[PDB]
Design a protein around this ligand. Sequence first.
Ligand SMILES: CC(C)CC(=O)SCCNC(=O)CCNC(=O)[C@H](O)C(C)(C)COP(=O)(O)OP(=O)(O)OC[C@H]1O[C@@H](n2cnc3c(N)ncnc32)[C@H](O)[C@@H]1OP(=O)(O)O
Ligand SMILES: CC(C)CC(=O)SCCNC(=O)CCNC(=O)[C@H](O)C(C)(C)COP(=O)(O)OP(=O)(O)OC[C@H]1O[C@@H](n2cnc3c(N)ncnc32)[C@H](O)[C@@H]1OP(=O)(O)O
Ligand SMILES: CC(C)CC(=O)SCCNC(=O)CCNC(=O)[C@H](O)C(C)(C)COP(=O)(O)OP(=O)(O)OC[C@H]1O[C@@H](n2cnc3c(N)ncnc32)[C@H](O)[C@@H]1OP(=O)(O)O
Ligand SMILES: CC(C)CC(=O)SCCNC(=O)CCNC(=O)[C@H](O)C(C)(C)COP(=O)(O)OP(=O)(O)OC[C@H]1O[C@@H](n2cnc3c(N)ncnc32)[C@H](O)[C@@H]1OP(=O)(O)O
Ligand SMILES: Cc1cc2nc3c(=O)[nH]c(=O)nc-3n(C[C@H](O)[C@H](O)[C@H](O)COP(=O)(O)OP(=O)(O)OC[C@H]3O[C@@H](n4cnc5c(N)ncnc54)[C@H](O)[C@@H]3O)c2cc1C
Ligand SMILES: Cc1cc2nc3c(=O)[nH]c(=O)nc-3n(C[C@H](O)[C@H](O)[C@H](O)COP(=O)(O)OP(=O)(O)OC[C@H]3O[C@@H](n4cnc5c(N)ncnc54)[C@H](O)[C@@H]3O)c2cc1C
Ligand SMILES: Cc1cc2nc3c(=O)[nH]c(=O)nc-3n(C[C@H](O)[C@H](O)[C@H](O)COP(=O)(O)OP(=O)(O)OC[C@H]3O[C@@H](n4cnc5c(N)ncnc54)[C@H](O)[C@@H]3O)c2cc1C
Ligand SMILES: Cc1cc2nc3c(=O)[nH]c(=O)nc-3n(C[C@H](O)[C@H](O)[C@H](O)COP(=O)(O)OP(=O)(O)OC[C@H]3O[C@@H](n4cnc5c(N)ncnc54)[C@H](O)[C@@H]3O)c2cc1C
Lengths: 387, 387, 387, 387
Amino acid sequence: VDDAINGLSEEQRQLRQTMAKFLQEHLAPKAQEIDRSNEFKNLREFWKQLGNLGVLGITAPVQYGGSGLGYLEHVLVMEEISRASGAVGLSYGAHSNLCINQLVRNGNEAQKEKYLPKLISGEYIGALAMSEPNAGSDVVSMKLKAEKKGNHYILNGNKFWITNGPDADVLIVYAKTDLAAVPASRGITAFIVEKGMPGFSTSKKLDKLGMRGSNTCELIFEDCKIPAANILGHENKGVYVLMSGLDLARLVLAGGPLGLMQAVLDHTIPYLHVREAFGQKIGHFQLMQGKMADMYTRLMACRQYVYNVAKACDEGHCTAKDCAGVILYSAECATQVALDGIQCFGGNGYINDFPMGRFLRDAKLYEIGAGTSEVRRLVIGRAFNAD
Amino acid sequence: VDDAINGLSEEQRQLRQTMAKFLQEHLAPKAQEIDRSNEFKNLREFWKQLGNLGVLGITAPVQYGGSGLGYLEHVLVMEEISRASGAVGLSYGAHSNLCINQLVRNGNEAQKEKYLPKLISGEYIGALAMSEPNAGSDVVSMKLKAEKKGNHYILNGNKFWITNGPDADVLIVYAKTDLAAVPASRGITAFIVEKGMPGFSTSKKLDKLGMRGSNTCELIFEDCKIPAANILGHENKGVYVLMSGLDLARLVLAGGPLGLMQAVLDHTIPYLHVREAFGQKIGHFQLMQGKMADMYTRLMACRQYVYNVAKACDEGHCTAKDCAGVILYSAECATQVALDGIQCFGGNGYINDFPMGRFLRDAKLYEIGAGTSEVRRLVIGRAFNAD
Amino acid sequence: VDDAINGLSEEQRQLRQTMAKFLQEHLAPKAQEIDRSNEFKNLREFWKQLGNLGVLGITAPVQYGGSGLGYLEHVLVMEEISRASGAVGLSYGAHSNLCINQLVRNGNEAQKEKYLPKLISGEYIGALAMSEPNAGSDVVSMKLKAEKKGNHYILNGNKFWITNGPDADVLIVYAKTDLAAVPASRGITAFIVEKGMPGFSTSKKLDKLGMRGSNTCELIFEDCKIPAANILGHENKGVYVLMSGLDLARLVLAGGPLGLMQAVLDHTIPYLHVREAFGQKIGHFQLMQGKMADMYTRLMACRQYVYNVAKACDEGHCTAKDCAGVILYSAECATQVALDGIQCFGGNGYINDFPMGRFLRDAKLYEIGAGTSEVRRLVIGRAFNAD
Amino acid sequence: VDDAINGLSEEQRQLRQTMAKFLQEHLAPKAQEIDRSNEFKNLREFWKQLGNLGVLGITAPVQYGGSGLGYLEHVLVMEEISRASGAVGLSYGAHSNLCINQLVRNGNEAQKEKYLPKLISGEYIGALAMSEPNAGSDVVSMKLKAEKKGNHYILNGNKFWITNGPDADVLIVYAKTDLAAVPASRGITAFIVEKGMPGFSTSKKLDKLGMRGSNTCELIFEDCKIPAANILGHENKGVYVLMSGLDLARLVLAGGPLGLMQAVLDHTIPYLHVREAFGQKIGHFQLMQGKMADMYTRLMACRQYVYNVAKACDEGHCTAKDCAGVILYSAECATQVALDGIQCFGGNGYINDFPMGRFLRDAKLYEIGAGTSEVRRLVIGRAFNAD
Ligand SMILES: CC(C)CC(=O)SCCNC(=O)CCNC(=O)[C@H](O)C(C)(C)COP(=O)(O)OP(=O)(O)OC[C@H]1O[C@@H](n2cnc3c(N)ncnc32)[C@H](O)[C@@H]1OP(=O)(O)O
Ligand SMILES: CC(C)CC(=O)SCCNC(=O)CCNC(=O)[C@H](O)C(C)(C)COP(=O)(O)OP(=O)(O)OC[C@H]1O[C@@H](n2cnc3c(N)ncnc32)[C@H](O)[C@@H]1OP(=O)(O)O
Ligand SMILES: CC(C)CC(=O)SCCNC(=O)CCNC(=O)[C@H](O)C(C)(C)COP(=O)(O)OP(=O)(O)OC[C@H]1O[C@@H](n2cnc3c(N)ncnc32)[C@H](O)[C@@H]1OP(=O)(O)O
Ligand SMILES: CC(C)CC(=O)SCCNC(=O)CCNC(=O)[C@H](O)C(C)(C)COP(=O)(O)OP(=O)(O)OC[C@H]1O[C@@H](n2cnc3c(N)ncnc32)[C@H](O)[C@@H]1OP(=O)(O)O
Ligand SMILES: Cc1cc2nc3c(=O)[nH]c(=O)nc-3n(C[C@H](O)[C@H](O)[C@H](O)COP(=O)(O)OP(=O)(O)OC[C@H]3O[C@@H](n4cnc5c(N)ncnc54)[C@H](O)[C@@H]3O)c2cc1C
Ligand SMILES: Cc1cc2nc3c(=O)[nH]c(=O)nc-3n(C[C@H](O)[C@H](O)[C@H](O)COP(=O)(O)OP(=O)(O)OC[C@H]3O[C@@H](n4cnc5c(N)ncnc54)[C@H](O)[C@@H]3O)c2cc1C
Ligand SMILES: Cc1cc2nc3c(=O)[nH]c(=O)nc-3n(C[C@H](O)[C@H](O)[C@H](O)COP(=O)(O)OP(=O)(O)OC[C@H]3O[C@@H](n4cnc5c(N)ncnc54)[C@H](O)[C@@H]3O)c2cc1C
Ligand SMILES: Cc1cc2nc3c(=O)[nH]c(=O)nc-3n(C[C@H](O)[C@H](O)[C@H](O)COP(=O)(O)OP(=O)(O)OC[C@H]3O[C@@H](n4cnc5c(N)ncnc54)[C@H](O)[C@@H]3O)c2cc1C
């Protein structure tokens, strides 16, 4: 059970309680089938249910269908998410933060009414596309060329590791319109892709080590046709557009490993008080007590950091350095906390009948996915050397 | 050099910068001298100057000349003083908190009026006497006993590890008044001991690896005739007074590790931007940028943790688990950050001309001071075993 | 490429090269399919091929068809087999040490002549039964009753976590004959059961996070008739063979983590030179170089530790504390090395298409299998309380 | 004590006990005073005794009174010396391996015949000059010029971090005779500087954080006439000596942290059994036992690694990667071992009355005094990029 020490207001505590009472019996009781089969049978039904509660538009205003709240509520609702089921935790972050908010913050009035009323209401699924096989860390070195032939841009190339690939209806794909410019950041341009366009196609879904349930595949572009009105931001100026959502991504996705740590704690604490060894409960031994103390301290340290950074972001003070730091620290702590939680179960933490191994495989994503720790360390270093 | 992520109000921000300009001219330039001489010559003058600023009774009510603020302001002042000088910060905390809070929470109407004015004004120094040479963590096994000689208490025994021993004019000493009770805790009772009483003396100031300049000695009680009116709390109720102050001293002293971890960064970052190696500044190498990023993220996480836990205790919801967890995490992270901060200076960090060695030696105290790193995990674990 | 720094004889190097050549042709390509399907159809054929090489009874006397080599060569073979497939390595460790090495040290002449030749030639598979569903770490608290009538023992009860269960032909099952004895340790008796006895029914295989391909099932004994000649050790004093087997099983099993670290290094080090980022190979970045340095140093330190401890056991300098220490250190280092190896690949380490995901799930077993990691710390700590 | 696990053959184990007894009867009761006064009054007598005992010049061949043994004996002697007194360990390492090894390897017949007879017996002190005030890690960027005038070399520059500066009678100082070469490494040249030459002087001793007692000061060169016969190796080829000797220096100095953490454990283990709390010895609690297990495992692993690497170099298999890796791992482990040892003592470990405070300060030198960990990881990293 979570306490009010996190600094949440009455409305935020009520929202957390509502998420806790709603995710149970609907999501969590079926995270083990999703993990075993890597498929969500009622994904669209669950998305429609989420759209009714307004969690998809937690940051978007009520004008377009959202709730009109801040990023603190987003990082809060993304901690309840991925807690009951870590599998579907990445899909919500890729839908709301990566696609909806990107159109809300850097979109025009025309584009802000065709896709967002569909995405916020859960009718369509959104996703972001920047990575590619030749550029997974060096995002400014893309190879997808975009040639102009009037009022339509033809995308040609290939991208990899696109979250929610086979099921997203609106995809924000970044492409290079000027591959001959000396500054690599001046050639990138954002585009809006909709399912059913000619030339666009999705490849086979990947069988990832962990986080199975969040669909991911390969995008193939062969003589595409996107109108000029679907350009997100401005042409040859996608540098600030790209590296603005990547910061809110690190800020909001930091709640992911927080939910994983909360889940492994809610699964570890009762188990240590029911399992007995050497005539006593295993929870009374000093080593298990120290493990629980370390896990609780790490969770409480990672939870207050992200929440305070989100509170600072909701007033005008934003920094990519802190947004990367909170998520890298959360992932680095969650990996060790999942390791300790598997260690506390012994033999039972190894079989697939317990979510111990699942939470371990899920925790490893945030360290390599959505930006590796090396990239974040280099960003913090460059931010420290600039001053 | 701090950031607004802490979420402190404008009034709390004023106290942050007020102590910043004061300590950098009154305490910072003499930190090396206090460390190498192990004697604060201006101790009483600095205490009176701080009492003029109102930071001593910052948690005391406004009736006795205090400030009336909360624990967060005391924590931030402690952090600033520890950043200026870790040795003086420990003494400031162990005086202000461990005397004024203990007197206002359990002292009667007469004891508060008698001692608090001159304690807040800086004329009287305070200290807490709970540890013993044979009982550091096991405080319930103390050997100091008290016997009722009519309307008087004859205290016999010794106390060890007392901060500001020879300097404190009013000291809170716990003494066992009964030994026939089945529970060992039911015999401990708190007493107020003044300086100069018959039978009270100090042996000698001891030398420590770190925190040099903070006076610590051994208390010797030889038939000390403490009056019955100097009893703190009630008869045979000292453990409830001790454990209450024990949980609060861990939260307040958390700024010490925070102050040291802020000072190592304030001294390290400007150094990497000056020294050059292999034809470029050392701050541009990835191995240094990664360490700087790790240290900054750890410092910010610990600071947000402490600041959020402090706010919860002012609302009226305090726990003993969180108070031990925050200080344990802060001490460990400050030690691990100072370890890298000394290495970042290379050969220059291994000499006494730079305060990095002092920052490292002062960081180890909070892992073996104000409790123990091992007993904190035990207290945290026993909280889950009781639920 | 292994270095001669390990301090091995020429014959040991030749054996290592022969094992590397044999496993690369027969086991290395199909290593991924065994993990994907959790089945080894060529198990008996591969076991026969190993028996033709003499590595199954490498620690057994030559009179039974074994090689008569020391524990160092056994650790070498374990590291080589775990280098290609971790599950096959665990199976070989459970076969050659838990069953074969147990009979040569505490079995009679007839019991050895009856079982060892088929176990060495690959005809019979060996297994050990210590763990129980209600006693995983506290093996002394086993409840398997072994009451006897005449010249037969009536075993009744279930045991869990039996490696090579469904495929084993000769199994060593520890049972408790006298449950009312005051000494809890002096009530265990080891019995040598075999496939075909009425009442020995094996359960289905267990799906686990790693080591896929090793058949682990629950044994069920219901009024089985075990002859009085199939007794390992002495009656009512089976605790001594149980701890003698436990002290030496942790030494040979240390090659598992060593083989996994060798595999992840031989997969990462070449991969860092055939991957490009920012116009350069990823292996030239200082952070990746530091990761390589840490992984190489940890692998080398653990390997030298295990080798020097194994060589000491060949001259009678055995110690349970050293074996627990080496197995704990090897598991803890292999876990971190497998975690770091995935980060070096980036995204290509989070999919089943690359073996980086398999080696991590297999390395986690060594921290909970064959004794919990905390139990190892307790065993090591109790070894200093008697000096 | 020690175990035969290290594989120490005859004439090596007896030397260990001999050194232990010698240092416990001579050096052990003086380490505290050496660390306190930052000086070693009995330096010349100690060096004479070491020369008479045959430990000085252990690696030197048997021509001038050397022992002619392998590096393993030197490693264990350095380990024992650092275990007795860490401050004297750095001086012994700089004397026996930093100076003598360069003389026996690259020194010609007439050169080594003049200095070694007066250097092995303990008369002269052997110092080394590589780093500079503006070049700590970038040793090839030295600015010490050496102009050639007939058969005389005139050096004009400054050095820093010179161990045993004012006491050394012969100093191997690298000078850049050609500042106009295309490769920066081809310009440096090693020269044998002797005390008493005109234009040579030394500054006052440095006040370091740790290693108090090992003299270190700045070297001053002003028109110092160096004879042409005092050249080491060949002209413009000084890099092929410095780079080839720095690996052996890092290898031999790796025994320092080994003996440091050995003394840490030898002081911690009896204290955990004598000190009692909560009605029993503190050494019986699970946390203390786990810390003891971790420290013992780390010490044994590092010792076995260093010994196995030293055995390889005795057979003619030297590598630059392993020599840096072993000392890096040893220092990084000894730091944490000293931290845990200080933690296990509690409050008593914080005062300078116990040697636990010196162990932490001495362990930090091997991370910055023998090349930083970053440079070591870079050297290890570059070893893989060359394949
Ligand atoms: C919502 C979505 C985007 C979330 C995701 O999950 S996407 C991430 C996955 N792909 C990746 O490649 C990992 C990210 N990669 C990195 O961070 C790399 O370290 C790179 C930054 C790309 C390094 O490549 P490099 O060519 O050196 O790029 P620079 O560092 O020099 O970029 C400087 C230019 O970026 C822009 N920028 C930086 N910070 C911000 C900001 N807070 N808001 C808006 N714009 C920003 C800035 O305008 C600058 O432009 P120029 O001065 O170069 O013209
Ligand atoms: C300046 C600087 C460097 C240092 C400082 O000034 S800080 C002071 C130094 N700190 C210390 O020495 C640590 C001493 N204490 C401890 O470590 C812990 O308190 C423990 C040793 C784990 C206490 O354990 P133990 O001896 O078993 O005693 P118990 O826990 O069983 O408690 C017995 C009685 O404790 C009292 N207690 C415990 N928690 C609280 C609470 N949250 N509020 C009020 N009272 C509490 C409680 O009354 C209990 O009594 P009963 O249950 O018998 O009725
Ligand atoms: C290979 C792979 C596929 C499969 C695997 O995973 S291997 C599976 C095997 N490993 C396990 O099952 C782990 C189980 N863990 C353990 O057994 C632990 O040792 C513990 C049972 C927790 C130890 O706890 P506990 O027995 O209560 O501690 P005690 O001090 O009371 O034990 C004393 C008894 O030790 C026994 N002992 C006999 N020989 C030795 C010997 N040469 N060295 C050390 N101990 C020995 C001795 O019998 C004594 O009991 P008493 O009869 O004297 O009372
Ligand atoms: C307290 C006391 C007892 C212990 C001490 O204080 S000892 C050491 C204190 N001083 C230091 O740690 C600084 C040492 N500095 C370094 O090692 C450097 O920073 C390096 C990481 C090697 C970087 O050197 P860098 O400037 O990049 O130059 P290079 O790496 O290209 O090498 C220069 C030339 O050396 C050659 N070299 C490298 N290794 C060896 C070898 N094992 N034997 C013989 N020659 C070698 C290499 O070929 C190169 O030649 P050129 O290509 O320039 O012609
Ligand atoms: C106002 C005040 C100021 C102080 N200032 C200082 C100061 O500046 N410097 C200073 O050094 N000390 C100071 N002390 C003393 C400090 O409280 C003790 O040093 C500390 O609590 C424990 O150290 P110890 O050696 O005295 O206790 P010990 O109990 O002897 O500690 C020894 C070790 O035993 C371990 N241990 C004990 N019980 C258990 C258990 N059940 N399980 C596992 N491990 C256990 C502890 O963790 C510790 O590692 C101060 C005390 C007071 C009251
Ligand atoms: C005989 C001898 C004895 C010595 N004895 C001592 C002694 O007793 N005590 C002592 O303190 N010193 C001693 N020194 C000096 C010591 O060897 C140097 O201080 C050491 O090499 C590190 O140098 P620096 O810190 O001055 O280099 P710096 O450049 O100051 O190092 C600062 C930081 O820069 C980093 N850095 C440099 N290059 C890179 C890179 N390419 N990538 C990433 N990071 C980098 C370093 O890693 C380090 O973390 C001695 C030197 C010699 C020659
Ligand atoms: C031949 C054989 C082969 C096996 N093969 C496998 C295999 O392939 N895979 C597999 O998963 N398992 C295997 N096992 C089971 C494995 O040995 C047990 O899982 C292991 O001993 C731990 O058991 P447990 O988790 O059931 O014990 P539990 O008691 O359930 O352990 C749970 C937790 O309690 C803690 N604990 C217990 N006592 C103490 C104490 N005194 N202090 C502190 N903490 C304590 C442990 O550290 C652990 O964290 C095998 C067993 C045998 C006999
Ligand atoms: C919208 C979106 C969705 C995503 N979804 C997922 C997902 O569902 N699952 C997932 O795992 N990931 C996801 N990612 C992360 C991204 O796909 C990662 O790049 C992923 O790990 C694929 O890796 P890669 O091998 O293509 O690139 P990388 O992860 O970068 O791998 C390349 C390797 O090169 C090295 N390298 C490159 N430059 C440097 C340097 N300067 N210093 C040191 N090393 C360097 C790396 O650190 C890394 O080891 C997503 C990213 C985005 C933007």
